Amino acid sequence: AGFDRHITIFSPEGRLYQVEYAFKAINQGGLTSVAVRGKDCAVIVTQKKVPDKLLDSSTVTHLFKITENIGCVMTGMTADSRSQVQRARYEAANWKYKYGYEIPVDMLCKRIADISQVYTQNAEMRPLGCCMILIGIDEEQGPQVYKCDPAGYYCGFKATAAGVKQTESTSFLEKKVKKKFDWTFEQTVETAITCLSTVLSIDFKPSEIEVGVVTVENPKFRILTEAEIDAHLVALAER
Amino acid sequence: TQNPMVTGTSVLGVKFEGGVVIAADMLGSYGSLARFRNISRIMRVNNSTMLGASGDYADFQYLKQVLGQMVIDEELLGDGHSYSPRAIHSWLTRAMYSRRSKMNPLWNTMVIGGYADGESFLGYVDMLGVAYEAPSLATGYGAYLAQPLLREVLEKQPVLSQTEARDLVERCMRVLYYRDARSYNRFQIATVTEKGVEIEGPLSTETNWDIAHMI
Amino acid sequence: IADAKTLIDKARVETQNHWFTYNETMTVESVTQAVSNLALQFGEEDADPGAMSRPFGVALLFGGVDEKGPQLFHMDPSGT
Amino acid sequence: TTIAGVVYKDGIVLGADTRATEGMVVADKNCSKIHFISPNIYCCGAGTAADTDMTTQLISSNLELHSLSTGRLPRVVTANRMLKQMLFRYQGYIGAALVLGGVDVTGPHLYSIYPHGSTDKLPYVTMGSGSLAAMAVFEDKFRPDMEEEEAKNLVSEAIAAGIFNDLGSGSNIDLCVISKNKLDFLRPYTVPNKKGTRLGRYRCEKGTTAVLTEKITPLEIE
Amino acid sequence: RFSPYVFNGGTILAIAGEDFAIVASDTRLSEGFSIHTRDSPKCYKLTDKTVIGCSGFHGDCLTLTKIIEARLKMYKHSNNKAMTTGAIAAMLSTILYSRRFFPYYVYNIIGGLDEEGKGAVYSFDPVGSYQRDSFKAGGSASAMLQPLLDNQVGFKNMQNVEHVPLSLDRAMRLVKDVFISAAERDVYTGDALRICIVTKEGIREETVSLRKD
Amino acid sequence: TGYDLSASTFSPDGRVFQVEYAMKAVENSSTAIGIRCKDGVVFGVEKLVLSKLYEEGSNKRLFNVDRHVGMAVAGLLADARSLADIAREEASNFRSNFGYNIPLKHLADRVAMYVHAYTLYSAVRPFGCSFMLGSYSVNDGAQLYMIDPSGVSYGYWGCAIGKARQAAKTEIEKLQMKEMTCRDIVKEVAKIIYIVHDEVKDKAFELELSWVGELTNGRHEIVPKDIREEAEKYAKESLK
Amino acid sequence: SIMSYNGGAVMAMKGKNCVAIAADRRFGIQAQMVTTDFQKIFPMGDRLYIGLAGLATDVQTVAQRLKFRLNLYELKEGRQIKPYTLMSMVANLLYEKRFGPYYTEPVIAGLDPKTFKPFICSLDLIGCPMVTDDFVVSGTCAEQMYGMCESLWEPNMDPDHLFETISQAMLNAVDRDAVSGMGVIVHIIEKDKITTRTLKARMD
Amino acid sequence: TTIMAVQFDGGVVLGADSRTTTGSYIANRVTDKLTPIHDRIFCCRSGSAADTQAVADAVTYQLGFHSIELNEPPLVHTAASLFKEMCYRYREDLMAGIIIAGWDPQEGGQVYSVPMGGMMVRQSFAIGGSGSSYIYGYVDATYREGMTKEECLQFTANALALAMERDGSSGGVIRLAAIAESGVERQVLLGDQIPKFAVATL
Amino acid sequence: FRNQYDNDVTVWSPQGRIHQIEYAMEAVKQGSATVGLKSKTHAVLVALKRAQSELAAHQKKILHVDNHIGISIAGLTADARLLCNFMRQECLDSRFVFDRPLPVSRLVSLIGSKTQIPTQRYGRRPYGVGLLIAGYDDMGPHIFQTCPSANYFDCRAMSIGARSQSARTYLERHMSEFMECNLNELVKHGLRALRETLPAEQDLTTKNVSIGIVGKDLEFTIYDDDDVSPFLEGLEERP
């Protein structure tokens, strides 16, 4: 063949197989992340797996804060994830400097995604093998959830997942939105945790998951403590 | 710094047997105003060297940061070598001459004092990059006032002890406080020795105002 | 012949530069070293575009009378 | 030049004269010194006229791109920051004194931008040669939470005071009212002065002027 | 406002010989009316056969000495030989002319032994025009020193006086005397004289006292 | 399969194999370990003596990247020295701009991003070095970080790199470093290195140790030779 | 001023379905006339004209550069430029050199390509566009010709009356200044024709 | 303009007048020269308004990016160092005098003074701007170690009032801010609230 | 096959070895042997020169960088000349700037960085030359070796080039006495060591030997064919 092995060249069917391989690179990590939106809150959950006891559990995280009121969860290569996180933080601060107001979540996602496009069009560099999911509150639009992928697609979502169990998780979430009644903050967090736990079969403990939330009442992105996570987990088991 | 903004005056230095001493007032003047009165115009470059400056304090701080990072990086590579006071003096001469050639002068005139390999060093560097070594040094109005006294005692006595050198710089600081407007009462004294660099805190000059009543 | 002409030009300009700067005549060894330095540049350590990527496909014999008397130097594509 | 602006209860009112002077001769009348940056943000300009026109046009285009991409109406702070950063980069060599006025999701915002990149958010602002007289009127009669008609009257009075007292200014008065709901751009709102009637007709009859040569070239209308 | 030059004073002298060259200078550095230091010799040993003396702006003197030493090392590495006095002279001319438009404010004298073994002195203006001279004085006291050298060494304006080749002893006597006179009647020059004599043996440095101000 | 030739490429199954091949580089290296305790961080390296001719205190794998931080490396020594120069430049720039000693987490992040730059581009290979960084500051505390050739960075209570990583990691795991103090930790580091050293395959080693902590007033430094000799004698005694 | 070095006068006027553009003919170096045939009005279309006064060199240079831009525009877009668009192009050209300006004061006069609505405007040194419905003037004698226009001009003039007015104004204005004169040329643009006449004027 | 900061235990009090001038015309009589560089770091701005605004926004940008990437509250010394590097590198083209004051957990309340020319000094109290000249004596006499927060507020108010009455460039209302671990309390003193001192009144 | 993974320096091998760097390390073996050894007061470099023909002069194997540093080369003369120029300029820069002789350790660190840059980037080849650097500084006599790989070592003694293992083993068995030797004893030891590398038929001569000595009182001097005769005469014979 040879139509793979370079991002620039098109297949005879015009598919650009290299970026599709970058999509597989996300699943190679073996972790899953889920994001679900609510009427007044947006949450991100992801597996936290510590391979060795010696590792400091505090340092390992896939949840990062792009700015005070935006948070992200990265899935894929850890290094590419950290690099994209840094680029996102730079883009947000530069937006604030130039335009005088906090970057919208959609525009941040668009900037990061079009950067991913310049990666998937120029020859020498490779697409970053990571996926981003951004959550924030916009005053006009309420909560928001968005996802960047290695291709440059940046579509917004009511709820999403990324990682190895993405298809199972989106099947689960699709059923839940179809039986739409609402999602308050507690139900939002419960839906996220139930989705992740059901698709993985994990039956989590508080250490195994890390959750981050935004709410219209408290717009700042915060990563909940193990105690708060256990509080939500116990509520799930009780009912 | 084409225009000096905040400046200090009159760093003095004299080399004694087994070391060198330098002293400086702690005032940075915003053009005839004693704006800053606790600034330190003497630095510890390394254990074997001191440096003190007269002129723009901002240029002094920049030189502090640059030279300190240089000293740090040699300490990091840690091969047992270190910069001599002669070496620091040479680099400083080069830097000031380059900034002069670029017509972006560093306004400061500095005294580099150090004791290494059993030999004392005391050297001058001007904003134009004029540099030399001498037994005693005085910058600013110190050159006109204090340096005669230092030269007299040194010409009659080529070698001096630490105690008499300290008394001498104190006396010269007293003279400069009397007859220089930009000067200040509080001053530091710092001495390089075989042991190392130690900078004394705010020291003050006893002043004789007897001639006032004579009028 | 072509890259020979190039190296001969380098030799001539270096001799005249030495005359200009020091008011003296180069030694045969120094001239041979001067051209050799140019020959070495096939490695492309320098970032200049105007250096031939291929080695110079010529060998030179430099013969001249210097302070040390008659001297004959050999130069090869390597630049040795 | 007199340009001035005020913030009323539910929006902004902007005002300016309509005179352009090259030296001490009135090069133009009915000049427009109220510019379009965005549908919700208009800006008066003073200083070097070309600098004002071109910088306002450039920021208008940049904000058009920004609004198109973001999909929401542009904010006034964004216009202010773009303007001030460009002006600061040019170090006052581009000469523009600007009264920036627009309404956005936050509310009504009035900004005053100097040639060197300074900015000031105020309830009322004036710029140009007549700024002092207009500011005298504003300092006298401005009150908070004015109605739209009251604000229009105040701005008209201020621009008129600049017109009569200052030489550089003087022509019809323009007003612009930006509200959250609507925009009303008011080329001449008032015509304080008018040219007098020409008592004597000097219309030159045909043949008054001699002609050495003539060439008529027909145009192929089609 | 900022003036990139200051005249740090000093004078330099060089006098050639049939088999020797001498280069001599004051050791005073003076900015304005004040004396920076009384021991700052203006003579520098470039090679065994060559000495350079520089007077003018001291920063330019220092940088030019460093440049000449570095380029001497570079010539040694490249050519596997030491620079001759003429070579150093031409190189110095080019170096000085490099900054035609922001010049080195220095008056330079190169004194040395040539390849033939005779003494040679090369004298330079601030912008690098250079000429071989039997003797020359440079710096603040050029005007005072050079006429007496012209009379005694060159036998100019002297009628019915025999011409003798200059000797080492007579040359050193003359140098000491002229520098004493310049010490008397030039404010800048005084407080010591360093005499650097170059012969086939090598540089030899003698210091003699001149009057302190 | 041409997928493994370059780092710009992806495998069809989503793997960048050049980076993994570079990760295999460090395993060629002799082991090095760093342990973090309450007082500070201790580093140790098993520096194999290839020849008697080589001077002692040469081929140092423990570098000082700033006064308050030290670096221990495994993998290609050339790449490691270059990375140390990069880290020193980053620390100096941080001091020059922000006016204080660089936080270790930030320094690890910056050098990790510099490393991660190389995995992307085709023109340049990934680094062949994996290195540990450690510092103690009264504000931040004891911190130990490890950077792989990929640019992944994490904080480790105890860490090992090189050939004997797994065995060293279990030995470190049975230690309880959190309660312990540095002057004991040097002895246990010596014990672990002597254990993991293979006498048959590796002829001889000279234990190279360093630490940073309150006992240094927060300066990374090479161990005093008396303490080195005490720890080495203890390690030989425990080895049996 | 540098503008007064060569000297010139340019005028345009708006009638009813017509425009007139008129300019002097002198070319002289500070006082010494060289030629009485200088072209200061150039054609930029079928019924669109530009008039340049100021430095002769910048007059010719901006005319040539504008014709370069305009010819590329006409070829690319397959239509004649609208007068307002030519104004904007000239303003961009002049503002490109905001520092080190071309020393000119252009005047555009023409009819719309389709409506044939008349258009007159002027631009400053650094490209400030001013559109007027009555007249526009530029050159050394702006003061005199401004007063003369303000008096003589009347709205909705016939072509013949427009020619008479512009001719009288230019002649009487350039009579009262030293550096412009030596004849004046009047171009009259109507939808169906262009009429160019050279008036009889004082050669002093 | 007059800008003044004073350090009390556990925080700082900042103070500044509201007057900015073009020549003898008061272009804005209600200017706010106390700007937040960060949640607990403020700068008092004196000198050219354009220069100070530009440098303040730039330092805000850099310190925010630094704070988020470090995941820690920024240090007042760090902000002051950024200000110094900018002002020193552009000392020829820049005309600004800044007082950087704030609270950080590491070193408590801090006050740093960046005069024109780009040098950094930490001071127990700092005064800057045109009007600081007139009140050097008042601050030198009045200042006492270990003042309370309210005492420092009154001290800053009195000093700024004196400088305002004696300086034409200074004037308007007094804008005062108190920055501490708890947060920023900003207040404005106007009219009768501004401290007033007697006149000679022959 | 594995012909792949050998083409360029920028390609890692499946077992973590950059084969082009190793192929460059083979280059030093091609050159004529060199030996360096030090005492408490001196550092010595000795070399075996080669000649293209009887009529041709022997090549220059020892080069002086500065008064306090000099080098001897094994491997490509081109790379040797280039690196020597770089080192000479670095030493000249140090003397100009700081007015001190450059530390030899710092100089070899600079060489290591400059040499390392080719290995990692596509383009310029690794410097396929091995140098022995010997100098005296304030710390004392020093000998270093630099490989075509940028790694460098500090040595009591070392030999590089063809058949250098024989010299290395001689040096190792005789190393203890070197430290207290006179310069004559030390140069004699080094001469015997390089004599080990020679073919049995060949023997040391005035022509094919060059000796380089530096010490506290001695600047770096290369004793040439005529000048090596005092040092060579002491040596007895082949064993």
Side-chain angles (χ1 to χ4, degrees), chain C residues 6 13-14 23 30 33 41 60 68:
Chain C
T6 308
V13 298
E14 290 291 327
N23 197 17
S30 48
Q33 189 183 335
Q41 303 316 126
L60 283 68
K68 301 168 61 165

Side-chain angles (χ1 to χ4, degrees), chain D residues 20 24-27 29-32 48-55 57 90 93-95 195 198 202 207-219 221, chain G residues 47 91-92 95 98-99 116 126-132 134 142-143 146 149-154 161 163-165 167-168 171 189-201:
Chain D
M24 308 311 283
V25 58
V26 171
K29 289 161 272 175
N30 207 44
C31 180
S32 186
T48 308
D51 295 345
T52 50
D53 296 347
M54 297 296 284
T55 192
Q57 282 168 19
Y90 279 96
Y93 278 87
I94 72 185
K195 191 175 175 284
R198 190 190 297 98
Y202 320 123
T208 294
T209 62
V211 295
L212 298 173
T213 61
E214 168 169 13
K215 171 58 175 78
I216 297 154
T217 309
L219 292 184
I221 181 61
Chain G
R47 36 181 81 78
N92 199 56
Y95 198 76
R98 189 262 179 277
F99 312 108
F116 303 104
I126 52 159
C128 171
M130 183 61 207
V131 175
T132 77
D134 43 8
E143 197 69 16
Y146 263 127
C149 290
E150 268 289 335
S151 64
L152 296 181
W153 185 84
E154 303 183 4
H161 289 298
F163 168 75
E164 292 294 324
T165 302
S167 42
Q168 283 290 98
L171 292 162
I189 297 96
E190 305 172 29
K191 73 176 182 64
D192 70 295
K193 57 174 169 175
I194 309 294
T195 304
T196 64
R197 309 192 192 76
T198 52
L199 313 190
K200 188 173 67 53

Side-chain angles (χ1 to χ4, degrees), chain I residues 12 27 36 55 76 79 85 87 102 127 135 138 155 179 198 200 205 207 223 229 235:
Chain I
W12 282 97
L55 296 154
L76 303 160
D79 296 330
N85 299 345
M87 292 165 74
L102 184 65
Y127 291 95
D138 53 272
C155 298
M179 190 49 57
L198 267 189
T205 63
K207 293 206 82 74
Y223 295 97
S229 59
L235 280 78

Side-chain angles (χ1 to χ4, degrees), chain G residues 13-20 118 134 153-154 157-158 162:
Chain G
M13 210 168 281
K14 191 183 292 207
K16 196 188 189 298
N17 314 130
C18 62
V19 295
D134 43 8
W153 185 84
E154 303 183 4
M157 270 186 292
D158 194 75
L162 190 70

Side-chain angles (χ1 to χ4, degrees), chain G residues 2-36 38-45 47-73 75-95 97-123 125-132 134-155 157-159 161-204:
Chain G
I2 197 73
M3 294 288 282
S4 82
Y5 188 90
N6 293 125
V10 165
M11 194 149 90
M13 210 168 281
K14 191 183 292 207
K16 196 188 189 298
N17 314 130
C18 62
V19 295
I21 182 158
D24 60 349
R25 315 294 300 287
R26 183 173 173 281
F27 168 61
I29 306 305
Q30 286 188 332
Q32 185 270 325
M33 61 74 62
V34 181
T35 312
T36 69
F38 201 77
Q39 183 172 7
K40 296 180 176 152
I41 291 156
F42 304 88
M44 309 306 301
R47 36 181 81 78
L48 187 62
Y49 280 82
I50 190 168
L52 281 301
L55 271 62
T57 182
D58 298 328
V59 159
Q60 297 178 339
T61 297
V62 303
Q64 291 165 15
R65 288 286 194 181
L66 186 67
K67 200 75 174 179
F68 179 100
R69 294 201 190 180
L70 178 69
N71 286 342
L72 294 167
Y73 178 91
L75 291 162
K76 289 276 145 197
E77 316 214 344
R79 65 180 184 275
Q80 299 288 264
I81 199 155
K82 287 167 63 166
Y84 192 98
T85 42
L86 191 65
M87 185 180 73
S88 298
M89 188 198 282
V90 181
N92 199 56
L93 182 140
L94 298 170
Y95 198 76
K97 318 297 279 285
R98 189 262 179 277
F99 312 108
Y102 287 122
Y103 291 104
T104 54
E105 278 270 1
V107 171
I108 308 290
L111 305 177
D112 184 276
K114 317 192 84 170
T115 316
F116 303 104
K117 176 256 173 194
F119 182 85
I120 66 174
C121 76
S122 72
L123 295 80
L125 278 295
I126 52 159
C128 171
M130 183 61 207
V131 175
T132 77
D134 43 8
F135 49 87
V136 292
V137 304
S138 275
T140 58
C141 71
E143 197 69 16
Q144 294 93 321
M145 68 198 297
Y146 263 127
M148 207 67 195
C149 290
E150 268 289 335
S151 64
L152 296 181
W153 185 84
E154 303 183 4
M157 270 186 292
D158 194 75
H161 289 298
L162 190 70
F163 168 75
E164 292 294 324
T165 302
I166 205 171
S167 42
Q168 283 290 98
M170 280 297 290
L171 292 162
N172 286 289
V174 303
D175 276 25
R176 303 302 309 181
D177 65 347
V179 305
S180 296
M182 312 282 164
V184 61
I185 190 162
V186 181
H187 296 247
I188 307 294
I189 297 96
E190 305 172 29
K191 73 176 182 64
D192 70 295
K193 57 174 169 175
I194 309 294
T195 304
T196 64
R197 309 192 192 76
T198 52
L199 313 190
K200 188 173 67 53
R202 309 196 77 186
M203 282 297 115
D204 62 356

Side-chain angles (χ1 to χ4, degrees), chain A residues 21-39 42-51 53-63:
Chain A
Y21 300 166
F23 278 89
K24 302 299 210 306
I26 292 153
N27 289 9
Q28 278 285 9
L31 295 171
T32 313
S33 59
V34 177
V36 61
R37 198 169 65 191
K39 75 188 290 188
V43 312
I44 44 177
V45 292
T46 183
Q47 287 193 94
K48 185 192 187 179
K49 288 188 193 299
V50 285
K53 76 187 70 51
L54 301 171
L55 268 162
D56 193 342
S57 49
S58 316
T59 311
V60 62
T61 188
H62 299 88
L63 268 58

